[PDB]
Every structure is written in C-alpha cells, then in structure tokens.
From a paper:
OmpK36 GD, referred to as simply ‘OmpK36’, is a 373 amino acid outer membrane porin from Klebsiella pneumonia involved in nutrient and antibiotic diffusion in gram negative bacteria, while Cld is a heme-b-containing homodimeric oxidoreductase from Cyanothece sp. PCC7425, consisting of 181 amino acids per monomer.
Data from OmpK36, which crystallizes in the monoclinic space group C2, were collected at a wavelength of λ = 3.54 Å. For OmpK36, the analytical absorption correction (AC) gives equivalent merging R factors to spherical harmonics correction (SH), with an overall R merge of 0.119 for both. AC generally gives better results than SH, with the exception of the heights of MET310 in chain B and SO4-1 in chain C, which are larger in the SH data. A clear trend is visible: the analytical absorption correction (AC) is better than the spherical harmonics correction (SH) and the combination of the two (ACSH) improves the data even further. In contrast to the spherical harmonics, the analytical absorption correction is not dependent on multiple observations, and hence is ideally suited for crystals in low-symmetry space groups or for radiation-sensitive crystals at long wavelengths.
Numbering used by the authors:
A (entry chain A): 0 to 140, 144 to 346
B (entry chain C), C (entry chain B): 0 to 346
C-alpha cells in the first residue's frame, strides 16, 4: 500500500500488484499464460473523536488475453463503512463473507489454495459476496473478535426469483446471515469458529441435477500457529447444500479440510507444504460419495523485499479420473506455477 | 477533492466515491443490491499567461454483480480542452449536453432523479453524450457578471452497420444525427438563477424504422428553469418540451413530451438535509392507439446526513404515481415504489 | 510522468492521456468519434545496490461508445521484471515483442501508422503480445556504448477449446505457438541508428485449417531499420520481410509479405511538427486465386502542435492508394481516405 494522499484527516492508500504468472499442466483450460494485476484504493476520513469513515475498492484485471477479448476485468471488493472508535465497525457493499475470517488462515499458499478450491467466490458467505452488511467488534466490548453479517437475496436474471443483479444458480443466494468468532489463546496461537445460514433459490433447486434443500449452512473451525518464523494452520468446514459439485450443482453435504505448514527464513525464502480435500456426500444421479477436491501442494516464495517476489507452486493432484470428475468438469491433472510479482 | 500531483504548472485531482447502496421494491429489475463506485481524474496544465489546457475522465464501476458478470464498467466522461481566459473554453469528447446546464438544477435528489428519469444518457444533448464539441463562456467575456452561455455541436452517432453507420454504432435508442445546442444562465442575485437551453438534432433512419413509436426527421428540446440556492434553502424547477427526443420506454420516442421537475431542500447545521420533489413526463400523440400517456410520474421524499465532506448516508423514497396500463407494461416502465438506503465514502 | 509516490526506495509513476479524437471518412466503420483514454502505472523498487525490481501496467479505455456498450476497455501492457545493473533486465507479461524495438522507429505519425497497419497487436512478436519473457542487454555488458540487444521467448497462446487449446484461448488471427525473437540496435553516430530484428514462431493447427489464406508450420520475420534523429529532423525507415506472419485482413495470412514504412518530420521551435510518411504491405502467393495483392498502401501527411509536455493538438491525413478490388472487399481492407483531428491532454 502506497499512501498517495494524507491531508486534513483524509487519507488515501493506493495498493495492488502485477503478477507475471505462467501455469504448466496437461489440463489445457489451466495451462499457459496467467498474468494479471490488481489495483485498489483504501480510504479513511476522520469524522469525530469516536467516528471514522472508510471505503475500499479492489479491481482485478487479467492481462493474459488479447485486446479484443471480453470480460477481462472485475471488482473483487467495493464497500463503505463506519468505525466507532474501538467499539467496532459496520460496512456494506461487496466484501468477504465472515466464513473467510477463519478459512483465510489456510489461504497462504504461494499461488494455489483459497477461493476456487474448497469454496468459491459468490458462494453464499464463504468468500467475496455481493450485498453484505457486516458488523465487527474487537475485544468483545478482550482480544476476542466477533462478526455478524447479513446478506440480501441475489437471485435469477429474470422470472419469479429475480433481483436487479441476477446471475446463474451457482452464484445465487437467498437471504442469509453469518457469524464468526476468533481468539488468540496464547501469543501466536489462534482458534476460530464460523457459522452461516442462507436460503437457497428456486433455480438452485430446479436447474442443476445435484443439490436439493431450502437452506445452505456452513460450520467452520480453525487453528493457527504464527510465531518463531513458523506458520501452521488448519481449517475444517462442514457444509449443507453450500459446496459446489463442479458444474453439476451443489453437494447435499460436504466435508472440507485444509492444512498448511510454512517456514520463513531470514534471507527471504519461505517454503510451503499443504494438503486440501473436499468430500461430497449424498449426491444425486447415483454419484453417492465423491471426492470434489484432493491434492498436496508444495512450493516456495522468495521475497527480494516487501515489493518484489518470485515463487513456484506445485499442485500434486490426487483425484482419480472417474465419471463424476469428467461430467462435473473437475480437473485431475497436476499444475506447476512460476511467477514474478511487483507489489505497491 | 484529492490533489495527488501539483508540480511545474501541472495538477492532477483524483476523485470518486464508493456507494454502498440497496434498493427495496416489488419491481424485481430494480430491487436488491446496487453497490457501485466512481473513479476519475481531473487534470490541468498551464500553457501560458492566457491559455490553460485540461482534461477529465470519469469511470463507473458496478460492484453489485459477480466476478464472471458482463459489462460492469463504463466511461461517463472523457474530454480534453483549452481555456483561453475570458474569451471562453472549448472541449471535445464524451461530455454533458448543454441541456443539462439547466436540468441539472433539479438533479439533486438523495438518490433518484437525474438521468434515467425524464431524460437519459446518450439521449441527444440531454445528458452525457459521445462526440460533443462544446464552447463555453462565463460572465459574458468578463463584462456581465453571472451571465453564462454555451454553444455545442455533436457529430452523428449511428447504426452498428448498414447505410446509417458510424465507427461507434449503437442501438436506435442511443443514436443521434448531427446536432447542436445552446444554453444561457443568469444569476440575477448570487442565490437566484434563471436559465434556458435549446437543442436540435437530426434523427437517424433506425429511430424511424425499428421502434413502433416516434416519427420525425428532427429531435428538439426547449428547457427553462429556475433556482434558489442560499440561506441553507434550495428550490429548483425545470420545464422541458421535447419533440421526437423523449424515450417512451422500450417502444420508441414520444412525438412530443412535456417534462416537469421541482424540488425543495433544507440544510440543517448538524448535517441533515431533507428533500421533497415531484417529477413527471407526459407523452403526447403516441402511435398504435396510445395517444397521450404518462411516461414518468412520482413524488420523492428523502434525506441525506453528511458526516463531513467525505462521508454521508441517505434514504430516498420514490412514491410512484403511474397507473399500471398497457403502455407502461409494453414499454417496460416501472410502476412500483422504491426505497433506497446508502452509505457513501467520497474522495 | 506524475510521480505520485517516491519513498523508501520505491517509486510510482501514474501516466496516461485523454485523446479527444474525430475521424472523417467515407469508410463508415472508421468515420466518426474516436475519443479514448489511456491510464498507466510504472513502478520501481530498489532491492539492493545491483538489483532493481519493477512493474508496469497500461490500460486502454474507449470513450466513443455508450454506457451500455461492450468490450470498451483492455490491457495493453502488464509485466513485472528485474534489472540487474548492466548484466541486463528480465521481465515477463503482456509486453512488446522485440520486432517493435526496430519498427517503432517509424511509429511516429501524428495519429495513423504503427499497429493496425503493416502489423498488428497479438500478431506473434510484432507488437504487444501475451506471455513474453524478455531479456535485454544495454551497451553490450557496459563495454560497447549504444549497442543494445534483446532475446525473447513466447509460450503458446492457442485455441479456445479442442486439442490446440490453452487457458487464454482466442481467434486464429491472434493465436501463436512457441516462438522466439531477437533484436539488435546500434547508434553508429549520434543521431544515426541502425537495427535488425528476427522472429520465429510455430503456427497453430487452427491457423492452418480455419482461414483459407496462409499455410506453413512456422511464422518468421526479418526486419532492418534506420533512423536519423538530430538537429530538429527525424527520418526513419523500416523494411520487414515476413513468412506466414502478416494478416491478409480477415481472410488469413500472407504466405510471404514485404512491408515498408518511411517517415520524415521536422520540429519547429514554436511547437509545430509536420510529418510525411509512406507505408506499404505487399502480399505474395495468396490462395483462392488472390495471388499478389496490396494489403496496405498509403501516403500520410499531417502535423502536431505541442502546447507543452502536457497538451497537444493534431491533424493527420491518410491518402489511401489501394485500388478497391475483390480482395480488399472480402478481406475488409479499407480503401478510403481519412482525416483525423485530435486534442490531447497527457499526464
């Protein structure tokens, strides 16, 4: 983040990165150039002694396709808020669902991991989401962070279930809420829990073959060790009608586990190993139990300084190629990524 | 505000906002999350004692849809110009048609009003438009304080292909032929103002052949308006008569229309700013049996609370007065009420 | 320019322009408003005494169409890199192919010329390209002053689907296989420069099956250029011979092509810069009975007035010498003349 303005109680921070990134894989929908950049602004205005206003915007711009390609930029974050001293905060807009307050702890791989793996974006309150109202509280009115979050319906393009901002069933949601709780038990050791409950939409219960139910729910617990140049974290999440069974629908229930170990050398190298799986249960069309995601991750980042880094990441895919993985379009091939990153 | 660069006669102002916004309505095409942000840059360069060069860009970025959605960002303004002291200024690009130099006086509602209501964008010289050349003069060459005028030309913006095409083609509703416009505002006191604007554009072939409604070779607008803005009080009205220029929803254009807007506001010292307004658009001589039809009719009541110059919150309540009829249904015109709630950070 | 951040060994430069631009032409796909803007960031971080890290992004935003139009913005450049003192530099991203290290010498017309004429973007290593790794060496390891060379590799950018696919698939016209290129330039005197460039890329199976024109496993370019730049005079020429690498409009590629560009300019002290140029592209051995064909042929006359480093105005007149024939019609190649007028704010 680069502070480009700070005057009369108003500050403006410009941030972002250019990620020169290549993927190597037998999966042709993944293989090739993946260069992209992100640009954002964080703004803060002092209102009074007990009140600060703020806003943030984060934009993703792909740079790996041609100058006539379409749909190459999208907003990741866009929200405005009030901070009432230390007595917490409120914001509304496109922001992270509170489930990520805990699952973010395993989202630290050099390249892979995070949204797209055990959960996705626009996926109820599991990641970035449209129309979230988020109340947060530090030190529970000590060191104990609480959030409560509401999300209005984001429905179909047209018909009964429509809203202004309609989309496909995979990215729809009804009215929902979430809550998170995180705590530093020792110095360095944190624990966290999160819960979300959302109504599903009529299209989610009629267009895809997989996943039926009135409500989507997530229960998450997570642990993190972050001291002494060591980073360990795990996340265990159980879901009902909330995890995507590739292109085929949702899984009636799923169990997602993510664990990672890393070490940070003084001279800037940071090796990383991780394991991720997603186990879907009670799937329609005779699928039954099925692996949705399963891989070991190894790689490393070298940090030249706080503004420049290079990395390699290797996804060792353990999924077996079967009828479910083919029909749902889930990749079973390995991937290697190489990148060079400038950040500001 | 936000001057991020001011060095050797060149300055750069980065401005914009992040508007956390939700609509509540029985209209499903309007209801729900409406979060969006604006970002722009105002730049100015001193060339010599008598000559300043400038440009401005303004972009709108929706944040209310997904990361795989289409067409979520667009340019509102992009223009470059020269200012020659009190001999006037000239700019070319995407800019406001001069009609808006008067109708902007009523575009002060907490959330509603403005483009989308009695006029829209890419709607001849009524709002933001492609390819306008605009000459402006303030205080009549420095000789008459408070007297401003504008002269404006717009090149044809035509079909996607065929005979009527230009490089930058669009659908008939946002097309225009060659056109011009003029405006004139006068500050009688330092709070009271009167203003007039006129425009005349050629219509294109698609505007006369594709939609069912509206026939004619020319689009004309006549606008008069009044404004009181002082002593914490804001009263403004605008009356506009149009010919082949006002959209009849998706069905075409109204052969003639009468648009009226009026608004009253008060700014309390602690930062609350209530607002009441009334807006209507009456269409006349519509084809296919429609005859005279209301295109828009509503009362608006709301309020903005300014925390400071960088942060506000607002409610706005559109009490819709249209009857649900054959015209409104076939033209895609909303007849439902709307409530808006917003929280806005601005820089 | 516009250094908006410089602190603790890290620098950020915000650059761009707002170009208010109109084209006049009988060619209706070219005629009309062409206003656009560019915005960019050049970033630099000192890592140690011998090593600098850097990144650059450049975005093109059209402003000549409506707020509901599609595909109005795109990335021209996006790359990250390391500079190793005088051992050289390495960057990867969307960047210029090295052939343009020489052909850029003739890309100096007031408005026309450059990509879109004798070569295009996403056209192997002739202009801006996805996925280029580029090594550059200055002054031949600090030894021979004015001698620069570059070595470049590009990975496959393939079809949207099927056997030839990559993640970032596109049309046959903008596809490439694995490829490499090299450039060499030398300032023989001050003001005078010579340069060579070569490139070799595999072609894709879609390029050899979908369009009717152009067959071969490999695309190749050979380029030589000269430049005089001194005493307020600018002269430059570029000659390029290509194999399976030059677009024959929409119909495919030319099995062989010969491209030639030459330009002459003078800079007057009061800011006027007149320009005259000639560009041709001659295609050989085209299938379907086309044979030898002119792909491009025009004389260019124009001028730019620089008010200062931040503002300019210009006119350019393309005098088109192509004869209208069945090749030009079917390939979509314009044979009409065009005048451009522009007013530009730059930061």
């Amino acid at each position: 983040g680069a502070e480009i303005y700070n005057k009369d109680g108003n500050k403006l921070d410009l941030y972002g990165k250019i990620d020169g990134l290549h993927y190597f894989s037998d999966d042709k929908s993944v293989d090739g150039d993946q260069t992209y950049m992100r640009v954002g602004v964080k703004g803060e205005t002092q209102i009074n002694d007990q009140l600060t206003g703020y806003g943030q915007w984060e934009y993703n711009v792909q740079a790996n396709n041609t100058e006539s390609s379409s749909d190459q930029a999208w907003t990741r974050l866009a929200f405005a808020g009030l901070k009432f001293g230390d007595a917490g905060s409120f914001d509304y807009g496109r922001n992270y669902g509170v489930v990520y307050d805990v699952t973010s702890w395993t989202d630290v791989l050099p390249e892979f991991g995070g949204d797209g793996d055990t959960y996705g974006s626009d996926n109820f309150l599991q990641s970035r989401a449209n129309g979230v109202a988020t109340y947060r509280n530090s030190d529970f009115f000590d060191g104990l962070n609480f959030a409560l979050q509401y999300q209005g319906k984001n429905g179909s393009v047209s018909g009964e279930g429509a809203t202004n901002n309609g989309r496909g069933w995979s990215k729809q949601n009804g009215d929902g809420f979430g809550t998170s709780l995180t705590y530093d038990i020792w110095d360095g050791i944190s624990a966290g829990f999160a819960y979300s409950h959302s109504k599903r939409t009529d299209e989610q219960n009629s267009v895809p073959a997989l996943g039926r139910g009135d409500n989507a729910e997530t229960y998450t617990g997570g642990l993190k060790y972050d001291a002494n140049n060591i980073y360990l974290a795990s996340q265990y999440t159980q879901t009902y009608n909330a995890t995507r069974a590739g292109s085929l629908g949702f899984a009636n229930k799923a169990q997602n586990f993510e664990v990672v170990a890393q070490y940070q050398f003084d001279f800037g190298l940071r090796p990383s190993v991780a394991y991720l799986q997603s186990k879907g249960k009670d799937l329609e069309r005779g699928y039954g139990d099925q692996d949705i995601l399963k891989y070991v991750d190894v790689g490393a980042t070298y940090y030249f300084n706080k503004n420049m880094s290079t990395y390699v990441d290797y996804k060792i895919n353990l999924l077996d190629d079967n009828s479910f993985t083919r029909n749902a379009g889930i990749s079973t091939d390995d991937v290697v990524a190489l990148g060079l990153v400038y950040q500001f």
